[model samples]
Target: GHMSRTVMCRKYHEELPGLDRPPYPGAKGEDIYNNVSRKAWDEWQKHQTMLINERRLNMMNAEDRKFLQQEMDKFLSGEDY
Candidate 1:
């Protein structure tokens, strides 16, 4: 069922109360923002903190995040990545 990467995702949505919906399967839980997204955010924050940080795309801010997301969106949309 998760072959489409929606097994755990779908189960999560179904198990939740008051959130029975198709879109709920795609929702990134709090773990995302706090742990996953935060890790990425921190990586970008690190980029801004050091003299050598800007040299690499290791850090990201709002604009950077948007840029990365735009790139991902474009790739996914085209299935070109």
Candidate 2:
């Protein structure tokens, strides 16, 4: 059986990613899996890269990670970015 969901990216209702391959892991990943489309996720990847490059973010830094998460929430949830 295929698992699917109605994602939030431009009104998507498609096959969901397998549990073994969530957007990342834990609650946030699950939220994305249940609500965000793959296309949106891919777009976010590009946007995230741009943000990282422009901001010169260090992934190891807690503040940087926090900023990324906040941006991710806005990007995925269709809020101001």
Estimate the TM-score of every prediction.
0.29, 0.70
Q: In model 2, which residue pairs have backbone atoms overlapping below 3 Å? A: none
- Stretches of candidate 1 above 4 Å error? 1-55, 58-60, 79-81
lDDT for each of the candidates?
A: 0.34, 0.70
What TM value does model 2 have? 0.70
The best candidate in terms of TM-score: 2
Model 1, residue 57: C-alpha shift (Å): 2.6
Taking the tens digit of each residue's C-alpha lDDT, what string does model 1 give over 1-81?
Answer: 222211222212222122122322344333232222222334434534552344344334666666555643343232333
Off by over 4 Å in 2: 1-21
Highest lDDT model number: 2
CA RMSD (A), model 1: 11.1
